[PDB]
Structures are given as structure tokens and as C-alpha cells.
Amino acid sequence: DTHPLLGVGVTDPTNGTRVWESELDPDLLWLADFVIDDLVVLPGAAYAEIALAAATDTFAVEQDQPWMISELDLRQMLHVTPGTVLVTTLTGDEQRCQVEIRTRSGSSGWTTHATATVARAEPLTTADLEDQLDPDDLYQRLRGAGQQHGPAFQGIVGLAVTQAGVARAQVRLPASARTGSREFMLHPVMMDIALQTLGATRTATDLALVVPVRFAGVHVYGDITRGVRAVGSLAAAGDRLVGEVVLTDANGQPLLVVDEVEMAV
Amino acid sequence: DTHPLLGVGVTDPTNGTRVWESELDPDLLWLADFVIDDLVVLPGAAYAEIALAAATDTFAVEQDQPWMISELDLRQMLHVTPGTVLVTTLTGDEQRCQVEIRTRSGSSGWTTHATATVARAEPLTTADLEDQLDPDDLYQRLRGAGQQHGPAFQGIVGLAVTQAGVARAQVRLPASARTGSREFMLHPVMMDIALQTLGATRTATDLALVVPVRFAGVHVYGDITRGVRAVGSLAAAGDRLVGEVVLTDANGQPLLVVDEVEMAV
Ligand SMILES: C/C=C\C(=O)SCCNC(=O)CCNC(=O)[C@@H](O)C(C)(C)COP(=O)(O)OP(=O)(O)OC[C@H]1O[C@@H](n2cnc3c(N)ncnc32)[C@H](O)[C@@H]1OP(=O)(O)O
Ligand SMILES: C/C=C\C(=O)SCCNC(=O)CCNC(=O)[C@@H](O)C(C)(C)COP(=O)(O)OP(=O)(O)OC[C@H]1O[C@@H](n2cnc3c(N)ncnc32)[C@H](O)[C@@H]1OP(=O)(O)O
């Protein structure tokens, strides 16, 4: 009945802050599947998940998706070592607040990995010739570079890129990531699975590893597990690879809208 | 392995504070035995206990009694209602800090009951004719006024007052309060049991209910369960009934030193 990533938390009466602590491990669920150069890093998507549940455990809301993510900076990666404790802090109001996700050293030393801003949620054909692409080349490309994705993250079963740069991918939630997923507000693997569609976009498909540093405008409208198609596009600005993905269900309705996915090497 | 009164706690990284939360109940151990006018109030002694364990769970010390209590204000009593949550906050350093003990309303409203100051611990015959007194008159007196003590708090098995005002009492730890006592740093019933020796002092024994508001200089040197004698004395200053008790073991060595026990109606 407890969120395996946020952990239980209490409120600090001296100020207005609220803290959360959670035990992390490479054995926790699908964490082992994300790997950057043989290390169990934490996927960027996860932070967004934790940032939302914090506002949910703090405020009373009678909606299935009352929160949207405004800004999401990611300062340093998190090596998931055994016995790692994850510390989260919330501060603000129900219209808008702030969330910091840090890692604890001993008991009085911490290292922040992601600062966030959360607010209330908002309301909901010419020459794009697709060249059918093999996913096991991307995965291989991605893995080759140094991003050995795990089975639970191999959700792209089919994908192609248009003659303009936009990438279209048929995604699904593999069963290994389906274990213990009702506790989430926004699955962290899907959101990554939606993000890795940027590996097929034109600007990406000529650099022969890219990591997402900052997000902006992450909108959730429905349970994102019911998603089968993601449309990925990105541009560049020197070192500013800005992106934009959208995850939609069978009937074309939107589920996940990510306005800006600024990336870097 | 967890303190039943302090509860588990986590550290707030936004500031330097550390919070603790604990479930309280009238069914918890000997809590039901303390009663003020048919209500399960929390005994003053308990706060001192919680204030010490907070500094112990916060700082590394290789001593059996490294902390002493400097000041202990008690603002409002705590009606122990079922499902009551107790909130404790620590702030300061290992040489000297501050502790607040409050009660939580819902999740974001609190009421402080006792502020405290804690610091490092310090190093360790003429006309006093005693008139042997019956404890079951004091208890009756005390109960009569409106302080129906419980069995676990009936530790005074023999007491007398000298021809000057000082009260001497042979105290013991009843078995009903002996259940689950290794978890404490300073038993809260004993300290009360040492305090109720002030009910035999001269200034007290002519008012025919007194409550302790503020303490000062509470020194602990040993496990206070091994105590068999308490020497109680107090004076008055209008509404300022200042006291002083000391709990000693069999071989006369001191165990509990309370410099000031300012009381009021
Ligand atoms: C996908 C793989 C893993 C994941 O899923 S996690 C995804 C997100 N998390 C990450 O792994 C990225 C974490 N960090 C990085 O990789 C990124 O840092 C990075 C390693 C790229 C880039 O290194 P920097 O630390 O320099 O980048 P910053 O995050 O500090 O911000 C960019 C820029 O702004 C400046 N900046 C930003 N914030 C601050 C502050 N606070 N103070 C001073 N200066 C600042 C800083 O000088 C930086 O200079 P350059 O990056 O060299 O251009
Ligand atoms: C033994 C029975 C139960 C126990 O074991 S618990 C033992 C300790 N706990 C208690 O039950 C006592 C709790 N409270 C009381 O009983 C005590 O209040 C009391 C009910 C007596 C006395 O009432 P007060 O609230 O007035 O007393 P204070 O604690 O506020 O302090 C004394 C005095 O200083 C002033 N004061 C002190 N702190 C403040 C602040 N912060 N702001 C403004 N003014 C303040 C205040 O005006 C007070 O005026 P009087 O008491 O009327 O003389």
C-alpha cells in the first residue's frame, strides 16, 4: 500500500516542508534493467513519477490526474548501489510547489539529483513517408553507445521515421515491467519508452550517448499504461538538443505530453 | 527495537531539523494509569524521557548517560485520546540543542506541549525527626484532589517527613511498570515517583492539585530503575512552588538530580 519509490514520509512542523525516505536497491523491481556503462543508474522518468506522488500524498484532490509537471531539472545521475536511501522534500501549495530529490549520506549529508516544479493539471498529410526500421538496431545502437537497456525497457516493438525527422513508434508495456505497477501515478518505464523514440529522429540518427537533463511541460491525462503509439521529434541548438514526444492510446487520444525534453551528451 | 514514545524519525535536509512521529494510545503500556480528573493525561516525566532519546538517536556518543536536561517548559497537557500522534522536533548540536514535543492535527496543524533544552552531562544530623506516614493517605489525598494514580505509579511503599519540611520516601518500581522498560533512557514513572515525594513536604502538606510546569537541571547518572530512596524538598513564592528531589540507590549513590521543579495549581 506504499509507493516503492517515494517511501513513507512525515511533515516538518518547524517550517512547512515535508520529507520522504525510501529504501532503494538494484534488486528493486525493474531497476536493474536500466544500465549506463554497466552501472544501474536511475532513469530520468522515475523522478517525474516521484515528484507527482509527493504532491498527491500532500494534498487532497478528487481527480485521477490533477497535477502537471512544469519544470524538471536533473543535476546528477544516481548510482543505484545497495542500501541506497532516497530523500524527497516538498514545499509549496496545491496550486504550485517545489520538489527536491536527493540521496543521503549517513544521516546528515545529502546530494540533490533533481529539482522540480509541480502545478495543477490543464485540460486535454503530405510527405511523411515512413521507412520501416528495426528496433533491434536501435537497441543495439543504444546499447552499443553505452546504454544497455533491460527487458522491461524494450517496449518498442516497431518504429519508423518520416522523411522529415519525426519518429513514430508502436510501444507496449512488457510484462517484466508490468509487475507491481498499480502503485504508480505515471509509470517510469513508459515515459522512458516514449522518450527513447527520439533515438530514431533525424538529428539523432546521424551521430555515428544522449542523456535528458531538463524537462518542461509534462502533462498526464490518463493512465499511461494504456498506450500503444508514441510520436517523437527533436531539433538541435549546438549543445541544446530540444525534443518533444507524445504518447497516445489506441483511439488516438493523448495520454502523455512532453513539451520540452532538452538533452545533452 | 524502537522507542515506543519517541517513534521513528527522519531528518529534514532543507534545514537542520529532525522530526519524529509516534503512535500513542491509552492502551500503550502504563499510560492508562496516569489520570487527572478521569482523563488519561501524559505525565510530565515522559517529556524528559523523549527529549533525551531524541539527542541519542541524533548524535553518536560512547557513554551510558552523556546528556543532561537544562530547561524543560511544559505549555499544555496532552489528553491521550486513541490514535494520537506525537510529533517531536530536534534542532541544535551535540553540545546543546532544542527539542519541541507537539501533537498533530490531521497533517498540517500542531500544538506544542513542551519545549526543552539539552546539553552534555556533567560529573556526578540534628533535628530531622521523621514521622512515619502512610502512603495510602497520600495516594488518597492525591486521588482525592483529582489525581487518581495507577498501579504502575504506586511506587512509594514507605515515606515520612522530617521536622523541617524535607520528605523522605522508600520508592520502588512496581512490576506493572516494569514491562517493556529496557527501551528507555530514563524511566518516566520513576521520575514521577521521585516527584510525588513532594506531596509529603511541609508546604504541600497544608493545602487542605499541584502540577509541575517547568523543570531545570535534570541530571541522570545511572540507570534510574535501581533506585530505592528519594529525598524531596520544596519551598514557595506566592504562585512559585519551587522544588528539588534526588533519587538514590541502595549504597546512597545519586542517580537522579532535579535542581528546580517549579510547580503551580
Ligand atoms: C539518461 C541517463 C541518465 C538518466 O536517465 S538521468 C537524466 C537526468 N540526470 C542526469 O543524468 C544528468 C545530471 N547531470 C548532468 O549530466 C549534467 O550536469 C551534464 C553532466 C550533462 C552537464 O554537466 P554540468 O554539470 O556542467 O551541467 P549542469 O547540469 O550544471 O547544467 C548545464 C550548465 O549550466 C550550468 N549550471 C547548471 N546548474 C548549475 C548550478 N546549480 N550551479 C552552477 N552551475 C550550473 C553548468 O555550468 C553547466 O555547464 P555545461 O553543462 O558544462 O554547459
Ligand atoms: C502533573 C499533571 C500533568 C502533567 O504531568 S504535565 C506537567 C506539565 N504540563 C502541564 O500540564 C502544564 C501545561 N500548562 C499549564 O498547566 C500552565 O499553562 C498553567 C495552566 C498551569 C498556567 O496557565 P498559563 O498558560 O497562564 O501559564 P503558562 O504556561 O503560559 O506560563 C505561566 C505564565 O507565563 C505566561 N506565559 C508563559 N509562556 C507563554 C507564552 N508562550 N506566551 C505568552 N505567555 C506565556 C502566561 O501568561 C502565564 O500566566 P499565568 O500562568 O496565568 O501566571
Structural biology method used: X-ray
For residue A196, give its domain range: 1-265
Q: What is the 3-state secondary structure (H, E, C) of chain A?
A: CCCCCCCEEEECCCCCCEEEEEEECCCCCCHHHCCCCCCCECCHHHHHHHHHHHHHHHCCCCCCCCEEEEEEEECCCCECCCCEEEEEEEEECCCEEEEEEEEEECCCEEEEEEEEEEEECCCCCCCCCCEEECHHHHHHHHHHHCCCCCHHHCCEEEEEECCCCCEEEEECCCHHHHCCCCCCCCCHHHHHHHHHHHHCCCCCCCCCCCEEEEEEEEEECCCCCCCCEEEEEECCCCCCECEEEEEECCCCCEEEEEEEEEEEC
Residues with Cβ within 8 Å of A215's Cβ and at least 6 positions away in sequence, in order, are A44, A48, A69, A71, A72, A74, A258, A260, A261, A262
Radius of gyration of chain B (CA): 18
Amino acid B30 reads W
Q: What is the CATH number of the domain that holds A4?
A: 3.10.129.110
State how far the Cα of A100 lies from the Cα of A2, in Å rounded to an integer: 20
* Residues in chain A followed by a break, C to N above 2.5 angstroms: 124, 208
Which residues on A lie below 8 Å from B87 (Cβ)?
Answer: 13
Q: Identify whether the C-beta of residue B224 lies closer than 8 Å to the C-beta of residue B247.
A: yes
Size of interface A-B (CB pairs under 8 A): 54
C-alpha–C-alpha distance, residues A9 and B5, integer Å: 18
Documented resolution in Å: 3.2
Q: Are A87 and B13 in contact (CB under 8 A)?
A: yes
Angle among Cα A129, A134, A136 to the nearest 5 degrees reads 155
B75 Cα: distance to centroid of ligand 2 (angstroms):
5
- Using only the alpha carbons of chain A, give its radius of gyration: 18
C-alpha to C-alpha distance for B260 and B243, rounded to whole angstroms:
5
Report the amino acid identity of residue B8: V
- Residue A55 main-chain phi, psi, to 5 deg: -65, -25
The structural domain count of chain B equals: 1
Could you tell me if B110 and B61 are in contact, meaning their C-beta atoms sit under 8 angstroms apart? Answer: no
Ligand nearest to the CA of B113: 2
B11: chain A residues, CB-CB within 8 Å: 19, 104, 107-108
| Chain centre to alpha carbon of residue A32 | 16
Distance between CA atoms of residues B203 and A133, nearest Å: 94
Give the single-character DSSP code of B190. Answer: H
Contacts of A211 (CB under 8 A, 6+ apart): A36, A44, A77, A263, A264, A265
For the record, the C-alpha cell of B74 comes out as 511544559
A103-136 burial string, b = 16+ CB within 10 Å, else e? bbeeeeebebbbbbbbbebeeeeeeeeeeebebe
- DSSP category for residue B142: H
With CB atoms and an 8 Å threshold, state whether B14 touches A17: yes
CA distance A265 to B19: 40
Give just the sign of the alpha carbon dihedral B144, B147, B151, B156: negative
- Which residues have CB under 8 Å from B93's CB, separation 6+? none
Cβ < 6 Å from ligand 1: which residues? A 36, 41, 43-44, 74-77, 211-213, 264
Q: Which three cell numbers stand for residue B159?
A: 515515606
* The C-alpha cell that represents A196 in the structure block: 527513447
| Cα end-to-end span (Å), chain B | 38
How open is the CA angle B216-B217-B219, to the nearest 5 degrees? 140
Backbone angles phi, psi at A64, to 5 degrees: -85, -15
Residue of B6, B19, B91 best to disrupt the A interface, most CBs of A under 10 A: B19
CB A224 within 8 Å of CB A205: no
Closest chain A CA to residue B91: A14
The answer to whether the beta carbons of residues A124 and A252 sit under 8 Å apart is no
Q: Residue A183 and residue A265: Cα distance in Å, rounded?
A: 32
